[PDB]
């Protein structure tokens, strides 16, 4: 309460940083911390990388036990923008989990935000069209403007939508 998930995630990582190697945390508490970090990233105002989380040694505690394999594979599918893997898990894990069901549209938007931002970064594209973005997000061209506008609200990039032309121009973006 009176927090954001990116902030909770950061405090959660910082707690590992402040602890001595003789950690009070256990394997069981690490499984819960790995889970909580990941749910926080899945709902994160500021997580865009995800790749560091997906390989942080904290996660060894769940992947080696298949403890939260569904959550891990969901955050993996976001990390690579793999809509088919994401959709196959979303088709089950949203329905079974009330927090994720409340955030169903946040999950499906975060993959879309991230897929575009990665594309713009790695392919070094600086002008795009609503068509290409719609292929990369599965939103219709008539709605995709609002998704990419929200990325600028999140402060991830410096760009301008050119919706009258069905276009976008980016000029800076956070590294993937």
Curated annotation (Swiss-Prot):
Oxidoreductase as UniProt keyword: no
- Is Transferase given among the entry's keywords? no
Disulfide bonding pattern of the chain: none
Give the domain of life: Eukaryota
UniProt entry keywords in alphabetical sequence: Proteasome
What processes in GO biological process is this protein linked to? proteasome assembly; proteasome-mediated ubiquitin-dependent protein catabolic process; ubiquitin-dependent protein catabolic process
Which molecular-function annotations from GO does this UniProt entry contain? structural molecule activity
Gene Ontology cellular-component terms for this entry are: cytosol; nucleus; proteasome complex; proteasome regulatory particle, lid subcomplex; proteasome storage granule
Q: Where is the PCI domain?
A: 7-175
Additional record remark? Present with 12400 molecules/cell in log phase SD medium.
Q: Which family does it belong to?
A: Belongs to the proteasome subunit S11 family.
Q: What does this protein do?
A: Acts as a regulatory subunit of the 26S proteasome which is involved in the ATP-dependent degradation of ubiquitinated proteins.
Q: What is this protein's name?
A: 26S proteasome regulatory subunit RPN9
Q: Which organism is it from?
A: Saccharomyces cerevisiae (strain ATCC 204508 / S288c) (Baker's yeast)
Q: What is the lineage of its organism?
A: Eukaryota, Fungi, Dikarya, Ascomycota, Saccharomycotina
